[PDB]
């Protein structure tokens, strides 16, 4: 019975697109038989990737079956590693789910199937290819014509991709760092955009909470590669200044609807932690009056600030930025009852810092 | 003479603050503010202090919150003619580090006198506009001035044409990085001030080409703002369309903005619109995309929301088999039949044709269109079928005899030998499918209770 597999291997390599219904039916038939890979050269894969790019666009149902078939065949985990490199990543080209209804229906399947492929190919891919790859995923996260579900996982792979970008940049002369940020602008762009789209909130909450929860890790991890303690360039820093201003806006709707809140914010507070304190102290002084202003409408953000100076080198540097701002705000306390409590609460925790780590906080 | 001494002193102090880095900020900022207070200060002194400020800012690696900005600009705003020139030397522009500084000042509030000089010489921008790096700065300076002064650029002047000319041409360059959103800002404001008609057509034409990624909810504002009677006047040149190279994509997005406009309402111009619209098809259509889907549905809504024999020629290709090739538009073609059959186009011969077409060729992608089409058809035809021959059962009979049917059950839910059909088929399928089991059963008892 196994002779069928070798029997079915012959057509797969052949049957290129050198009579519309006949050819469409012919390609569909090969999709059905190619699904049965229970047994587990690469000749069959060569034709599959050949016809994968050559599939006519108007054949919506044919592409529907092909994409599902493409998902199944790539699960081999043995030869599925050869199809990406061999096909030169042509799938990254415009051939992605060509066809009107295919675009507006099966785009999530097309990107998701490729997402898993690059998920494992990550360690088996160079920097130059990754630069091409991330481009499509960068569009996915920001594009508003796609389901939010894929927008979340589009970052999930990017979290691991940047490490590969870092890895290849470490391995060879790949200009990863310049690439590493290019999506960071997209990441912050998402925040400024998400802040505007939270207005609908005033199931979507789960989507929004899930969406941001993915973003924080994505932005958090890239900083690891970006710094790899080393000082950060000025124009490079300005992106983060935008990040904090937009980020604090996003983390709002989750109090007028706490484990996750602390979880994400503590992850968030780390984004500015590992980077050089000298570049850090630059970021917040410009934005600290806003963040203190923002904390007034949502106390939960204080979990950042309090955790911000609760341990790392951030303590001494942030404390100076905080009290210096509060001191000039000191007259305001005692007049605006709603705001007066805020400054005192801020003053209480910073004084909590000096008690906590008197080393250089006493001096501060 | 005094200013020269401080100029020397500032530089010496400025070297110290960086030296200290590897009072100073206050001292250096204050002396810089001294130049603004003191009048009769030479214009030439801008270049010396500007360089050291630039030299130290890069040396100190700070650009935001640097104390030297605010006191510095106050001096520049008093002397904007020279500073713009010194920033407009070609070599200085080529340096991105120097280029960034120039824009930062143009953002500040005190630049309002400074930006007036730039607005006074539109010809200057055209020189840089008509490579990318040099061009990109030209876009930023153009957008920034308009950002504060919306009135400027509202004049019917060739400057928009120069942006328009390069605008359409250079969509392939993005295949600088932030130019698309930046460039669109200038023209959109111009369209906002005055209806650009054909000018508005071009920005939409390129709005979704060249692999752009930055227009989120930015273009849509004019469409919403376009409504706050204009459609009839706006539609006339749209029919012209002056394409000379256009494609379906351009028209597709063009009708997208119309749909909100036609959702506004309905003057007598609608009468001539119907005649004009039905003269478009040109018999042979080479568009095998959503253009037909958008165009066909758009015609249906406008006439009822706002000779008709010529309109039905549109659905003739989708009344046939080979014509209306793409099923996606074929479902939309049926969707058109549901809409057009609302007022007086109800005939038995065509009523049967559309009804099975919805259930025939069931698919998930078809489910969306047929579900939408069925909603319009459900109050139109089934009433005739209810008083007619109850033909819905015949097709339901055909499918079960052959051997999927939930679509008919959904229609029947809105609407007695059939009762056995749903019960008989569902129980076998039930062995998910649990959804339609309960809903129809409740109607089954209600229908039995009623009669």
From Swiss-Prot, chain A:
Subcellular location: Nucleus
Protein's job: Adapter protein, which is found in various multiprotein chromatin complexes with histone acetyltransferase activity (HAT), which gives a specific tag for epigenetic transcription activation. Component of the NuA4 histone acetyltransferase complex which is responsible for acetylation of nucleosomal histones H4 and H2A. Plays a central role in MYC transcription activation, and also participates in cell transformation by MYC. Required for p53/TP53-, E2F1- and E2F4-mediated transcription activation.
Protein family according to the UniProt entry: Belongs to the PI3/PI4-kinase family. TRA1 subfamily.
Subunit structure: Interacts with MYC, E2F1 and E2F4 transcription factors. Interacts directly with p53/TP53. Interacts with GCN5L2. Component of various HAT complexes. Component of the PCAF complex, at least composed of TADA2L/ADA2, SUPT3H, TADA3L/ADA3, TAF5L/PAF65-beta, TAF6L/PAF65-alpha, TAF10/TAFII30, TAF12/TAFII20, TAF9/TAFII31 and TRRAP. Component of the TFTC-HAT complex, at least composed of TAF5L, TAF6L, TADA3L, SUPT3H/SPT3, TAF2/TAFII150, TAF4/TAFII135, TAF5/TAFII100, GCN5L2/GCN5, TAF10 and TRRAP.
Domain text: The PI3K/PI4K domain is required for the recruitment of HAT complexes, and the MYC-dependent transactivation. Although it is strongly related to the PI3/PI4-kinase family, it lacks the typical motifs that constitute the catalytic site of PI3/PI4-kinase proteins, and lacks such activity.
Involvement in disorder: Developmental delay with or without dysmorphic facies and autism: An autosomal dominant neurodevelopmental disorder apparent from infancy or early childhood. Some patients present with intellectual disability and renal, cardiac, genitourinary systems, as well as structural brain abnormalities. In some cases, the phenotype is less severe, has no systemic involvement and is characterized by autism spectrum disorder and/or intellectual disability, sometimes associated with epilepsy. Affected individuals manifest variable dysmorphic features. Deafness, autosomal dominant, 75: A form of non-syndromic deafness characterized by late-onset hearing loss that involves mid and high frequencies, and progresses to encompass all frequencies.
Protein name (Swiss-Prot/TrEMBL): Transformation/transcription domain-associated protein
Name of the gene: TRRAP
Segment of the intact protein contained: 242 to 731 of 3859
């Amino acid at each position: 019975n196994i002779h069928n597999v070798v029997a079915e291997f012959v057509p797969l390599i052949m049957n290129t697109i050198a009579y519309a219904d006949f050819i469409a039916a012919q390609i569909k038939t090969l999709s059905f038989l190619a699904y049965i890979i229970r047994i587990y050269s690469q000749q069959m894969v060569k034709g599959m990737l050949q016809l994968l790019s050559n599939c006519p666009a108007e054949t919506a149902h044919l592409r529907k079956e092909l994409l599902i078939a493409a998902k199944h065949i790539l699960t081999t985990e043995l030869r599925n590693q050869f199809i990406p490199c061999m096909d030169k990543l042509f799938d990254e080209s415009i051939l992605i789910g060509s066809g009107y209804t295919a675009r507006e229906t099966l785009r999530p399947l097309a990107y998701s199937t490729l997402a898993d492929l690059v998920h494992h190919v990550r360690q088996h891919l160079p920097l130059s290819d990754l630069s091409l790859a991330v481009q499509l995923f960068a569009k996915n996260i920001d594009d508003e014509s796609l389901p939010s579900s894929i927008q979340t996982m589009s970052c999930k792979l990017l979290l691991n991709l940047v490490d590969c970008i870092r890895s290849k940049s470490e391995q060879e002369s790949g200009n990863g760092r310049d690439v590493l940020m290019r999506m960071l602008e997209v990441f912050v762009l998402k925040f400024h955009t998400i802040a505007r789209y939270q207005l609908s909130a005033i199931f979507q909450v789960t989507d929004c909470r899930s969406l941001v929860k993915t973003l924080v890790c994505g932005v958090k991890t890239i900083t690891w590669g970006i710094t790899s303690n080393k000082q950060l360039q000025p124009k490079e820093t300005q992106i983060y200044i935008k990040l904090v201003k937009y980020a604090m806006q996003a983390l709002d709707i989750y109090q007028v609807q706490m484990k996750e809140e602390k979880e994400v914010l503590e992850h968030f507070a780390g984004v500015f932690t590992m980077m050089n304190p000298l570049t850090f102290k630059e970021i917040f002084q410009t934005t600290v009056p806003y963040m203190v202003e923002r904390i007034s409408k949502n106390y939960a953000l204080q979990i950042v600030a309090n955790s911000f100076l609760a341990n790392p080198t951030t303590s001494a540097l942030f404390a100076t930025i905080l009290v210096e701002y509060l001191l000039d705000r000191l007259p305001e306390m005692g007049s605006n009852v709603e705001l007066s409590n805020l400054y005192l609460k801020l003053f209480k925790l910073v004084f909590g810092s000096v008690s906590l780590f008197a080393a250089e906080n006493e001096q501060m | 003479k005094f200013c020269d001494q401080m100029m020397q002193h500032l530089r010496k102090w400025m070297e110290v603050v960086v030296i200290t880095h590897k009072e100073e900020m206050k001292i250096c900022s204050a002396i810089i503010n001294l130049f603004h207070l003191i009048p009769a200060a030479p214009q030439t002194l801008v270049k010396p202090l500007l360089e050291v400020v630039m030299k130290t800012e890069r040396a100190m690696l700070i650009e935001a919150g640097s104390p030297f900005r605010e006191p510095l600009i106050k001096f520049l705003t008093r002397h904007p003619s020279q500073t713009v020139e010194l920033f407009m030397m070609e070599a200085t522009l080529n340096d991105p580090q120097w280029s960034r500084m120039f824009m930062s000042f143009l953002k500040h509030k005190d630049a309002r006198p400074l930006r007036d000089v730039l607005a006074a010489n539109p010809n200057r921008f055209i020189t840089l506009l008509l490579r990318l790096d040099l061009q990109f700065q030209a876009i930023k300076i153009i957008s920034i001035i308009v950002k504060n002064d919306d009135s400027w650029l509202a004049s019917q002047h060739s400057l928009v044409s120069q942006l328009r000319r390069v605008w359409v041409s250079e969509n392939f360059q993005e295949r600088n990085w932030k130019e698309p959103k930046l460039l669109a800002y200038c023209l959109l404001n111009y369209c906002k001030r005055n209806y650009g008609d054909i000018e508005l057509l071009f920005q939409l034409l390129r709005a979704f080409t060249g692999r752009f990624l930055c227009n989120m909810t930015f273009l849509k504002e004019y469409m919403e703002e376009e409504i706050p009677q204009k459609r009839a006047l706006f539609f006339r040149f749209v029919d012209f369309n002056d394409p000379n190279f256009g494609d379906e994509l351009k028209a597709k997005v063009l009708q997208h903005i119309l749909n909100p406009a036609f959702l506004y309402s309905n003057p007598e111009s609608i009468t001539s619109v119907f005649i004009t619209k039905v003269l478009d098809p040109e018999k042979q259509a080479d568009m095998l995309d959503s253009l037909r889907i958008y165009l066909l549905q758009y015609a249906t809504l406008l006439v009822e929301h706002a000779k008709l024999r010529r309109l039905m020629t549109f659905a003739w290709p989708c009344l046939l088999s080979k014509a209306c090739v793409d099923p996606a538009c074929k479902y939309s073609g049926h969707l058109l039949l549901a809409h057009i059959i609302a007022k007086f186009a109800i005939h038995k011969k065509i009523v049967l044709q559309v009804f099975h077409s919805l259930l025939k060729a069931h698919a998930m992608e078809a489910r969306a269109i047929v579900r939408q089409a069925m909603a319009i058809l459900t109050p139109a035809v089934p009433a005739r079928m209810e008083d007619g021959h109850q033909m819905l059962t015949h097709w339901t009979r055909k499918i079960i005899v052959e051997e999927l049917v939930h679509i008919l059950h959904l229609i029947v839910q809105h609407f007695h030998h059939l009762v056995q059909h749903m019960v008989s088929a569902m129980q076998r399928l039930g062995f998910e499918q649990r959804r339609l089991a309960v809903d129809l059963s409740e109607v089954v008892i209600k229908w039995e209770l009623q009669r």
